[PDB]
Amino acid sequence: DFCKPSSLNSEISGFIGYKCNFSNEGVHNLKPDMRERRSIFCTIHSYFIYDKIRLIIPKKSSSPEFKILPEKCFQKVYTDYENRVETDISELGLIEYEIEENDTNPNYNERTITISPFSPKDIEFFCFCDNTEKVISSIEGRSAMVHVRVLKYPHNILFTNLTNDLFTYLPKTYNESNFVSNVLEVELNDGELFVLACELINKKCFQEGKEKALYKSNKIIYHKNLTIFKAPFYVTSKDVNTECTCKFKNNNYKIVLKPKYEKKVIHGCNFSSNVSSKHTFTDSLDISLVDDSAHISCNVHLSEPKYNHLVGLNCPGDIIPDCFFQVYQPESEELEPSNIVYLDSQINIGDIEYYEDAEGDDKIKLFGIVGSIPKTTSFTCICKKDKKSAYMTVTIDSAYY
Amino acid sequence: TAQGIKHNNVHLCNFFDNPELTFDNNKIVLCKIDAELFSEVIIQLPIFGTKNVEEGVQNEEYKKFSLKPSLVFDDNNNDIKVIGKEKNEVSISLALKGVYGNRIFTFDKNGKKGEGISFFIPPIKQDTDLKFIINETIDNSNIKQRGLIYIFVRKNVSENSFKLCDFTTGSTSLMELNSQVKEKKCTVKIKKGDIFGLKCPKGFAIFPQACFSNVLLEYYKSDYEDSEHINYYIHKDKKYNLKPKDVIELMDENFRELQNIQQYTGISNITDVLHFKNFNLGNLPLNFKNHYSTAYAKVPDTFNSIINFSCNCYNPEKHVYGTMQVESDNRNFDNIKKNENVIKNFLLPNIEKYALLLDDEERQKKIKQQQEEEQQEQILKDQDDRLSRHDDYNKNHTYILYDSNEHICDYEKNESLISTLPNDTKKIQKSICKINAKALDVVTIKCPHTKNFTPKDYFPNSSLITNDKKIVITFDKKNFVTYIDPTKKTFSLKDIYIQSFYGVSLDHLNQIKKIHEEWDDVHLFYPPHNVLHNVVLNNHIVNLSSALEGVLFMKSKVTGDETATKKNTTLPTDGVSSILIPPYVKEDITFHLFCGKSTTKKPNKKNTSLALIHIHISSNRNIIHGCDFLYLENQTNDAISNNNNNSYSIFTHNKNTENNLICDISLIPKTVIGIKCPNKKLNPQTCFDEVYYVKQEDVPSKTITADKYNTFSKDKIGNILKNAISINNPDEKDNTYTYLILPEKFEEELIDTKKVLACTCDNKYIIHMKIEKSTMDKIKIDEKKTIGKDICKYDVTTKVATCEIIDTIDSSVLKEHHTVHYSITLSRWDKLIIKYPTNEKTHFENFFVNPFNLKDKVLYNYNKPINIEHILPGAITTDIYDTRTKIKQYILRIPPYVHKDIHFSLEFNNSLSLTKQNQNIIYGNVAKIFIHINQGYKEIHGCDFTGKYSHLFTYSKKPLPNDDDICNVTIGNNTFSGFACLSHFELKPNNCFSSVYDYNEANKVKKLFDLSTKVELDHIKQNTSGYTLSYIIFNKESTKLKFSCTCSSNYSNYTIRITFDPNYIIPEPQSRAII
């Protein structure tokens, strides 16, 4: 029932995955091959909560020409991609991070780095794997690079301390003295990251609750006696009770997390006649009360430097493709399956705060946008029912590109 | 009470024409054989009962002989029979411990046919008693005996020292092999003075032929324990390393057998060089359709070094073969320069384009234009393509004839891959060059230099003559020129079996036992000469002349220097040579060739390096056109012989109504002809430069003569107006016939309708090149091509996606969309289905598929096929045939996970089909298909047990000897899971996940549907690469139960523990590969 926080991430056999593999047998080897010529970026542009990014490289005894730049990556990393300026990773200001160098395999060498979300500022570091020096019949090798832009979490950190250890770089907003009757209740704004320190926690710490149905997008991870709780972008009710239990000092401390309730007007479209549902949409165009199979459309547009908006679609019937994990590519006269593309790639954000709900036959797909998109992007979700179809379009013209 | 005619390495007892053992003697007449040591045992008995052999030697006075049993003695032959106590017989193959070579033979000169009985001794550890009788049968009360026989084979081996691979039965038995399982393993371990044997099951034949007399050059390391050194020549205790004269080098006009025996030869002499007691069945093993292809050999006593090699069984009926590994157990190299120190490397080729219509200086001045255009479309697909690359090219272009290319694997350029390290001499190197060549592509390989043999002959020819060398021996549909002892009749089919490597002419046979023949060069190579002819097959040698029908050996060119002349293809004399890949190939089997280097004239693994080269050749499915004159000879053979049921040829062989000498061939575009005439026997040799014109006088043309084609007049077009490149070089006496082809478009201006040009071959058959108005009508109706870019259908509630194909290219419908291109973009787990006809359905009687299979020959590069599993692993295949409508369907469900943008094309074609409506002709059409997938999502939450699938499953369990695993998986709804196990393994319980154990219910077997009715399933029992996979997806199941499976095998087991539980432990990173 109760175990140390770090033990919850070890409950898996084999390997956890999430590896940037550039070995000869890896995902994209650098060996001279006629089958590919494009550059390789295993970029993961996103916040990191003790997340594991692993680099797999061939053994030097097998591929001496294979270079590792910096040679002790991730212990040493590059901060200038174009110029490859080497700096010690510790000098980047990374907070409570760790790196590993595993070589328990004759075929390859493994490098693993874990990054906490506690960096006071955005940190970007790069590691280069160069095999272009392999001159085989004048056929140069390919170059691989691991991009890890550790963005400072774009929300306040509500840290609670219930341990015998001191966290130098944490806000330490709450501690044991704030637990009334061994119970602490705090309010988190949309997307706020909550962190709890405790040596012995329940295996379901912030995983179960009474009214936490709206709190499930959390990627709850545990490390360094710390439990990290990433609040979802959007909620529909204030009373979202997420509970955790801490056994600090043999006392049953209780931690309750609830949103700072402020419903976000959805900068999307509502094709359902139920315009009084739990959600609110900027644009509404009822599919019903439409005869002769007349098509309807709604061009949603967004443009701001930073994005704290909620974009989604509400419509009866089925969505083709099933948004938002796959969405149409806007570049076509008719938005047919030939335009199917992943939304994570369409808007260049992999940190999309997906939120899906349904009311009867009405499919509701919503997702939160935090930060900014490096390029202007747009996507379209088509909703079809019987003989009539509704076209949903979002144009996110962020101040970039 | 005495012995017989035992002849040490040979054993014989002739009672037919032997004065010692014939009825002429009125005293004791009997023979005894103490056979041993894998040597033949010949019994040449008189005729027992009137047999259809000859007359005169079997006159009435010599016809009153008979003794049981008088069985079949014609070309059809059963196992030799040996009489026993009951006066009846038992099969010799079981009377002695596995006899081989049980064949009957007869003498030909003056028709002295006799029931010769030859058989080769197998390993035997005891003295076996076989007894016969010889009886005279005049009539009842006149039956008198005159002799008997007694075979007394002796002990020559021991059970411990004898290793055998009885491929008939066992887990490695080759009988169970089918289209899905092609090969099984076996080995024989032989230490000092051991015995090894091979026995293919009935229906297989041993290859390479002459094994084990000549075997693979794989490993050669010396041992200190050896008592006798090696010489590499006919001297010392070995009797090989010489080449033939009077079989292949001395030929005459009457010799018509030159191109009919170029099947298998060219292997190295190491085993002979190593004094191995090699015994073989030559190039003609037993009648394996009802017999076992068997051979035996023994380790030499005075030799104890290291050698590695292998030989194989084979059968093309089901594409099944078995490898036989042979090695010396005395591996006295377990610590120095062994496999661990053998560095493995790879090489890539240099690519050019063949001079299809160009010359030497054009190689530098013009072929650049050809080379710089083809790859533009591939570049367009790589970069320009964003949605789908349809065939939008419909004007001012041609594809079929422009795809020719050239590939070169030069090792003299990459000396590091074959030469020893300059300073790090503590290791040896191995290299492998890969060429993925296709049809119409010239493959030229470069390697170090090594030259051929040089026999010699000497004799004082004066006041002497040798006129006792005029005799032949006939058996198994063949007649052989061999030699016989005048009195003792001591010879051997072993001599006949090796006669392919030797011959005797004139009077020069002085002191052959002492020969030190050497090459003109020092470097080691395998095969010694003409590597591109005797192409290697990984661990097997075969002749390319017959193995690859239609192959052309292309001249070598080290340099086009000022002294250049008409060079030849001989390798490795100059280290350069070239061949042509025919458009039609019998099978997709790949071929190889070995290259090596050394420092001195007597080197070995201690001072040598090994290199390998790989060239891939595409197969074909559509029969060629033209006449195979050797097939007409095969028809005359069918008249000669009755057991030629396997009358299969790769040519349609269009037949005239009544005449056989005539070959009425129609020059049709988009077709390939295969007129097969040996070397340049085609007459005139300048044909078609010089031809003979006959006119449409007799429709059947039954009354025609070949000699008539000598007097005709020609004044049309001209004689020298169109010239082509050389495509037949008779320097190599084993070259194929010329090839004639046409482009995608044809012209009607220069045709002559009522007249036909002709050429002759074999002095009997006549070639006729005609053209019909039907072809002109077909082209005039098909030139107007219309192309339509359509889209397919799909459903989301079922996640189905399929296109319409068959209703498009019907040849009985008026066409406004003569061509249609279908591109359909799919995603994970999408079940694609392809419906296509065959060449039997109504209005589709000539339909053909390009590529040649939707399941294993899809296209990855422009007009370059490859298997689906080589680039798209974990794909399910299911090819089926409809019961009535003659419809062929395929299932192409996409793998759940994909790591890179993927788009492959596979086409169809029905242009060869047509039908008649209202006395008018309606022709066929063409179609194409394109698919797009892109990356997947939610990579499989399971475990892999093959290694190569490491990028598809979370866990990659690389198998190890006697391995065990506990693959615990916890998945939720909409979560993909599965496992991959080797095809050779067995799934226990069977058909997982369809029926699986229960984790909590005492591992009870429960049906997948019973466990959860919402569980979709898909299974891969076996695939081309040799792996077994199972797929499972849970969709909105309102329960959390558990189950388990287990992959099991003799030396490997894997356990899968499965529990179903909704969960989410992914932050959606989805590692982003830019590719």
B427 contacts in chain A (CB < 8 Å) = none
Best CA proximity match to A229, nearest among A241, A242, A218, A238:
A218
* B728 vs B554: CA distance, rounded Å: 8
Q: What is the token pair recorded at B834?
A: 């392809």
Nearest CA in chain A to B435: A34
SS3 B1007: strand
Q: What is the token pair recorded at B20?
A: 């010692």
For the purposes of burial, counting CB atoms within 10 Å of the CB of A104, is it exposed (0-12), middle (13-18) or buried (19 or more)?
A: exposed
Q: What is the token pair recorded at B755?
A: 């007249």
B473 CA to centre of own chain = 30
Evaluate whether A305 touches A352 at the Cβ level (below 8 Å).
no
**Residue type at position A182:** N
Q: What are phi and psi of B702, to 5 degrees?
A: -70, -35
Query: Is B825 in Cβ contact with A340 (below 8 Å)?
Result: yes
A residues 313-332 closer than 8 Å to B (CB): 318, 320-322, 325-326
Using only C-alpha atoms, chain A has a radius of gyration, in whole angstroms, of 24
Q: Given CA atoms B794, B799, B805, B806 in this order, what sign does their dihedral have?
A: negative
Query: Is B827 in Cβ contact with A326 (below 8 Å)?
Result: yes
Evaluate whether B204 touches B344 at the Cβ level (below 8 Å).
no
Query: Is A38 in Cβ contact with B1075 (below 8 Å)?
Result: yes
Q: Strands B406-410, B350-352: parallel, antiparallel or unpaired by DSSP?
A: antiparallel
* A106 vs A58: CA distance, rounded Å: 9
CA angle B10, B13, B17 (to 5 degrees): 120
Best CA proximity match to B198, nearest among B163, B242, B237:
B163
Evaluate whether B951 touches B986 at the Cβ level (below 8 Å).
no
Which run of H or of E encompasses B370? Answer: helix B367-379
Evaluate whether B32 touches B7 at the Cβ level (below 8 Å).
no
Stated length of chain B: 1075
Evaluate whether B897 touches B976 at the Cβ level (below 8 Å).
yes
Evaluate whether A367 touches A311 at the Cβ level (below 8 Å).
yes
A139 contacts in chain B (CB < 8 Å) = 348
Query: Is A18 in Cβ contact with B1069 (below 8 Å)?
Result: yes
Q: What is the token pair recorded at B261?
A: 């025996």
B592 CA to centre of own chain = 12
A36 contacts in chain B (CB < 8 Å) = 1075
* B267 vs A77: CA distance, rounded Å: 57
* B852 vs B188: CA distance, rounded Å: 39
* Cα separations in angstroms, B461 against A303, B48, B492, B984: 108, 45, 28, 66
**Rounded to a whole number, what is the distance in Å from the CA of A126 to chain B's nearest CA?**
15
* B680 vs B736: CA distance, rounded Å: 9
Q: How many CB atoms lie within 10 A of CB B623?
A: 13
* B220 vs B226: CA distance, rounded Å: 14
* B1031 vs B994: CA distance, rounded Å: 10
* DSSP 8-state assignment for residue B380: I
Residue in A12, A14, A36 closest to B1075 by CB: A36
* Cα separations in angstroms, B418 against A96, B350, B436, B558, B698: 53, 17, 21, 19, 65
B393 Cβ partners below 8 Å, 6+ apart?
A: B399
**What percent of the residues of chain A are helix, what percent strand, and what percent coil, each to the nearest 5?**
5, 40, 50
* Cα separations in angstroms, B230 against A267, B221, B275, B605: 89, 12, 8, 15
Provide the Cα torsion A288, A289, A293, A297; round to 10°.
Answer: -60
* B573 vs A398: CA distance, rounded Å: 70
* Cα separations in angstroms, B1064 against A2, A212, A311, B793: 20, 15, 23, 34
* B1024 vs A271: CA distance, rounded Å: 50
Best CA proximity match to B36, nearest among B149, B150, B151:
B151
Q: Strands A388-396, A296-302: parallel, antiparallel or unpaired by DSSP?
A: parallel
Q: What are phi and psi of A287, to 5 degrees?
A: -70, -40
* The residue to which tokens 């866990």 are assigned: B955
* Cα separations in angstroms, B64 against B144, B146, B889: 11, 13, 67
Helices (H) and strands (E) in chain A, counts: 1, 31
A17 contacts in chain B (CB < 8 Å) = 939, 954
For the purposes of burial, counting CB atoms within 10 Å of the CB of A1, is it exposed (0-12), middle (13-18) or buried (19 or more)?
A: exposed
Q: Where are the beta strands (DSSP E) in B885-1026?
A: 887-891, 903-909, 914-917, 920-923, 926-932, 940-944, 953-956, 966-971, 976-982, 986-987, 995-996, 1006-1007, 1015-1020
Best CA proximity match to B571, nearest among B437, B450, B718:
B450
One-letter-per-residue 3-state SS of A80-98: ECCCCEEEEHHHHCCCCCE
* B1074 vs B710: CA distance, rounded Å: 70
Q: Confirm or reject contact between A338 and chain B (CB < 8 A).
A: yes
* B526 vs B447: CA distance, rounded Å: 11
Evaluate whether A392 touches A281 at the Cβ level (below 8 Å).
no
Q: How many CB atoms lie within 10 A of CB B935?
A: 20
SS3 A301: strand
**Rounded to a whole number, what is the distance in Å from the CA of A113 to chain B's nearest CA?**
15
* B722 vs A171: CA distance, rounded Å: 91
Residue in A12, A136, A340 closest to B348 by CB: A136
**Residue type at position A380:** T
A residues 215-234 closer than 8 Å to B (CB): 216, 219
One-letter-per-residue 3-state SS of B129-155: CEECCEEEECCCCCEEEEEEEEECCCC
* DSSP 8-state assignment for residue A263: P
* B240 vs B271: CA distance, rounded Å: 10
Query: Is B1068 in Cβ contact with A350 (below 8 Å)?
Result: yes
Q: Confirm or reject contact between A171 and chain B (CB < 8 A).
A: no
* Cα separations in angstroms, B402 against A123, B364, B739, B743, B744: 54, 18, 16, 10, 11
In DSSP terms, B758 is beta-bridged to: B692, B768
Q: Where are the beta strands (DSSP E) in A131-238?
A: 143-150, 157-162, 183-188, 193-198, 201-202, 221-223, 226-230
Nearest CA in chain B to A351: B1068
A377 Cβ partners below 8 Å, 6+ apart?
A: A346, A347, A348, A396, A398
* Cα separations in angstroms, B1038 against B31, B577, B976, B1060: 88, 69, 17, 10
Best CA proximity match to B1075, nearest among A368, A313, A38, A180:
A38
Residue B324 has, within 13 A of its CA and on its CB side, a CA count of 28
Q: How many CB atoms lie within 10 A of CB A87?
A: 14
What approach was used to elucidate this structure? cryo-EM
Q: How many CB atoms lie within 10 A of CB A372?
A: 16
Q: Given CA atoms B16, B22, B23, B28 in this order, what sign does their dihedral have?
A: negative
In DSSP terms, B137 is beta-bridged to: B143
Q: How many CB atoms lie within 10 A of CB A184?
A: 22
Query: Is B1067 in Cβ contact with A44 (below 8 Å)?
Result: no
* A148 vs A140: CA distance, rounded Å: 26
Q: What are phi and psi of A337, to 5 degrees?
A: -55, -25
Q: How many CB atoms lie within 10 A of CB B220?
A: 22
In DSSP terms, B904 is beta-bridged to: B931
* B337 vs B605: CA distance, rounded Å: 8
Evaluate whether A42 touches A61 at the Cβ level (below 8 Å).
no
A222 Cβ partners below 8 Å, 6+ apart?
A: A5, A6, A7, A8, A9, A50, A201, A205, A228
Q: Where are the beta strands (DSSP E) in B418-490?
A: 428-435, 442-446, 472-475, 478-481
Query: Is A46 in Cβ contact with B937 (below 8 Å)?
Result: no
Residue B861 has, within 13 A of its CA and on its CB side, a CA count of 15
A residues 12-71 closer than 8 Å to B (CB): 12-15, 17-21, 25, 27-28, 32, 34, 36-44, 46, 49, 51
* DSSP 8-state assignment for residue B340: G
Structural resolution in Å: 4.7
In DSSP terms, B596 is beta-bridged to: B610
For the purposes of burial, counting CB atoms within 10 Å of the CB of B215, is it exposed (0-12), middle (13-18) or buried (19 or more)?
A: buried
CA angle B575, B580, B584 (to 5 degrees): 150
> Which parts of B453-512 fold into alpha helices (H)?
493-498
SS3 B383: helix
* B1068 vs A51: CA distance, rounded Å: 11
Q: What are phi and psi of B715, to 5 degrees?
A: -140, 25
Best CA proximity match to A228, nearest among A10, A93, A50, A355:
A50
Provide the Cα torsion B491, B493, B498, B500; round to 10°.
Answer: 110
Whether the link from the prior residue into B851 is cis, omega within 30° of 0, is yes
DSSP B598-647: ESSSS--GGGEEEEEEEE------SPBBS-BHHHHHHHHHHHH-S-----
* B922 vs B776: CA distance, rounded Å: 14
Best CA proximity match to A55, nearest among A46, A68, A38:
A68
* B1012 vs B315: CA distance, rounded Å: 46
* Cα separations in angstroms, B891 against B352, B430, B665, B826: 38, 41, 40, 14
A219 contacts in chain B (CB < 8 Å) = 1067
In DSSP terms, A242 is beta-bridged to: A209, A257
Evaluate whether A139 touches B348 at the Cβ level (below 8 Å).
yes
Size of interface A-B (CB pairs under 8 A): 88
* Cα separations in angstroms, B107 against B2, B81, B249, B486: 28, 21, 26, 13
Query: Is B796 in Cβ contact with A322 (below 8 Å)?
Result: yes
B227 Cβ partners below 8 Å, 6+ apart?
A: B302, B304
